[PDB]
Amino acid sequence: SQSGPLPKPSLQALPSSLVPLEKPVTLRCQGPPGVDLYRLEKLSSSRYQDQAVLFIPAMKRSLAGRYRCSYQNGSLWSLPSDQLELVATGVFAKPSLSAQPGSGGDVTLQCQTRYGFDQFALYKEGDPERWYRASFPIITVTAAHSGTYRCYSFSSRDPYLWSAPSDPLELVVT
């Protein structure tokens, strides 16, 4: 007899869930101690394994996408983990990031790229990291932290196939 569902395990990609093509990544599922069976799966495919750990020595376009895991106790399945979004990076030439300070506390940044991409992603280093997504290459940021910013471009047709990261831009507020 049992009070409720088994708590979900965590699912983590080391060293990062942004993985340049041909670089290694390790997906690790972690539940409480004493798990009988771990199941790790890739969503929208028939792909899954009965093991906690997936080691991808060289990242590929085909391994990019949504993953989750769960575990079994007896024949009972746990709640599933939060979804890990595995991004293949370096699929396209890097964009060039520029930034135009605004007149009152805002900064407009620009992820320039020679293609028709429709999605762009801007971030600042050092956890907590701060992300920003836009359907347009111009991105306005309010009350921006000083820090090191980079951007990525990609198409919503394959939103896990990302460009190489732009060269860093160093924002300093005063």
Partner: peptide, 15 residues
């Protein structure tokens, strides 16, 4: 063998 786990969430609905 026992059944697999429940599947994932369906996609988002129309806005």
């Amino acid at each position: 063998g026992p059944p697999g786990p429940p599947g994932p969430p369906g996609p988002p609905g129309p806005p």
